[PDB]
Amino acid sequence: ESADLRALAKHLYDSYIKSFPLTKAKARAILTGKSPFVIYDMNSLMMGEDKIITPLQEQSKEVAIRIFQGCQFRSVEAVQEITEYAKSIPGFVNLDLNDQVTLLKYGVHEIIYTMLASLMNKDGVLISEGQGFMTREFLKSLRKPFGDFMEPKFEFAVKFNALELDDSDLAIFIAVIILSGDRPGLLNVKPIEDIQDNLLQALELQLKLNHPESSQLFAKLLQKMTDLRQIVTEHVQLLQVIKKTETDMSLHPLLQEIYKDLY
Ligand SMILES: O=C(O)c1c(Sc2ccccc2)c2cc(Cl)ccc2n1Cc1ccc(Cl)cc1
Ligand SMILES: O=C(O)[C@H](Cc1ccccc1)Oc1ccc(-c2ccccc2)cc1
Ligand SMILES: O=C(O)[C@H](Cc1ccccc1)Oc1ccc(-c2ccccc2)cc1
């Protein structure tokens, strides 16, 4: 029933609003003008780092290393809030715990990038809960291989943002991503597909109601999941070049655990 689906949509949204201080609405409100300092080069980064506690040993490290060490902090927090949102998805806590961990290891960064897109435009990304703006070309200018981390997230975000989703849309779309039945190592595929198919109905209903003059938005949205797997795939391959060139780069053990036996 359309009444059941709108209930599921509403449930996911209320749960999404509860778990994620980063919302498209707030991000868009900052990019609309409804103030942030701009890091566009080395000089402006140093000025800006002050205006956004880390040990002195970590502070004395290379700029490139420091930028990706610090994003890690918001990253692991995202993985925790994403994990809690997952549990609030009907049926998920009833999956086998091995399958719960597997969907979540494969899914968290696709969601992180989906939510990250709200903060990017074709020129830069809102940082520090919207207080700052770091440019895409300055990220590209970082020492190799660091200059290559972010550029494929920008290319996705420009296209993902062109669809003008609401948070109420994204609440369902990210639930769909977590409950993907074809992740490697899933024991019970069909209970997972059982929930997702029902989530794909909610998402379809939600797009027809929220985007009535856009007939194939659903199709475009579902394809972006291919973009996200490719961005994770690329991102992980880059982490190993970072294990071979960089050593002092302090990876976070939860990120280590997620990136084990993955793609
Ligand atoms: O903590 C931040 O605000 C931040 C950071 S941390 C940071 C930012 C600028 C200078 C030093 C550290 C970050 C780094 C990159 Cl390459 C891209 C986006 C970044 N952001 C924005 C961001 C938003 C959400 C999430 Cl999960 C991670 C990062
Ligand atoms: O610091 C945090 O707890 C979160 C972590 C998080 C990151 C991605 C998805 C879910 C959670 O990161 C944020 C990133 C941006 C923002 C934000 C807030 C207001 C306007 C724009 C961005 C808030 C939190
Ligand atoms: O993998 C992740 O969770 C993050 C994702 C992310 C990266 C930038 C902005 C928002 C999210 O990307 C990273 C890139 C490099 C590193 C890192 C940290 C310490 C040592 C080596 C690499 C950690 C995270």
Swiss-Prot record:
Drop me one GO molecular function for this one. Answer: WW domain binding
Annotated membrane-spanning segments are none
User: According to the UniProt entry, where does the motif 9aaTAD sit in this chain?
Assistant: 253-261
Instruction: Report residues of the Glycyl lysine isopeptide (Lys-Gly) (interchain with G-Cter in ubiquitin) crosslink.
Output: K18
Q: Does the keyword Transport apply?
A: no
What's known about how it's activated or inhibited? PDPK1 activates its transcriptional activity independently of its kinase activity.
How would you describe the post-translational modification of this protein?
Answer: Phosphorylated in basal conditions and dephosphorylated when treated with the ligand. May be dephosphorylated by PPP5C.
The terms describing its cellular component in GO are: chromatin; cytosol; intracellular membrane-bounded organelle; nucleoplasm; nucleus; receptor complex; RNA polymerase II transcription regulator complex
Q: Which residues form the NR LBD domain?
A: 4-261
Gene Ontology biological process terms in this record: BMP signaling pathway; cell differentiation; cell fate commitment; cell maturation; cellular response to hypoxia; cellular response to insulin stimulus; cellular response to low-density lipoprotein particle stimulus; epithelial cell differentiation
Q: What is the effect of changing R74H?
A: In colon cancer; sporadic; somatic mutation; partial loss of ligand-binding
Tissue specificity comment: Highest expression in adipose tissue. Lower in skeletal muscle, spleen, heart and liver. Also detectable in placenta, lung and ovary.
Question: What inducers act on this gene?
Answer: (Microbial infection) Expression increases when incubated with M.tuberculosis or its lipoprotein LpqH; induction is TLR2-dependent (at protein level).
Q: Where in the cell is it found?
A: Nucleus; Cytoplasm
State where it is primarily located: nucleus
Q: Enumerate the UniProt keywords alphabetically.
A: Activator, Biological rhythms, Cytoplasm, Diabetes mellitus, Disease variant, DNA-binding, Glycoprotein, Isopeptide bond, Metal-binding, Nucleus, Obesity, Phosphoprotein, Receptor, Transcription, Transcription regulation, Ubl conjugation, Zinc, Zinc-finger
Which residues does the annotation say bind rosiglitazone? Answer: Q72, F73, R74, S75, H109, H235, Y259
Family label: Belongs to the nuclear hormone receptor family. NR1 subfamily.
Task: Provide the disease association from the record.
Answer: Defects in PPARG can lead to type 2 insulin-resistant diabetes and hyptertension. PPARG mutations may be associated with colon cancer.
Task: Describe the task this protein carries out.
Answer: Nuclear receptor that binds peroxisome proliferators such as hypolipidemic drugs and fatty acids. Once activated by a ligand, the nuclear receptor binds to DNA specific PPAR response elements (PPRE) and modulates the transcription of its target genes, such as acyl-CoA oxidase. It therefore controls the peroxisomal beta-oxidation pathway of fatty acids. Key regulator of adipocyte differentiation and glucose homeostasis. ARF6 acts as a key regulator of the tissue-specific adipocyte P2 (aP2) enhancer.
Subunit structure as annotated in this protein's UniProt entry: Interacts with FOXO1 (acetylated form). Heterodimer with other nuclear receptors, such as RXRA. The heterodimer with the retinoic acid receptor RXRA is called adipocyte-specific transcription factor ARF6. Interacts with NCOA6 coactivator, leading to a strong increase in transcription of target genes. Interacts with coactivator PPARBP, leading to a mild increase in transcription of target genes. Interacts with NOCA7 in a ligand-inducible manner. Interacts with NCOA1 and NCOA2 LXXLL motifs. Interacts with ASXL1, ASXL2, DNTTIP2, FAM120B, MAP2K1/MEK1, NR0B2, PDPK1, PRDM16, PRMT2 and TGFB1I1.
The written remark on domains in the entry is: The 9aaTAD motif is a transactivation domain present in a large number of yeast and animal transcription factors.
Record-given protein name:
Peroxisome proliferator-activated receptor gamma
State the organism named in the record.
Homo sapiens
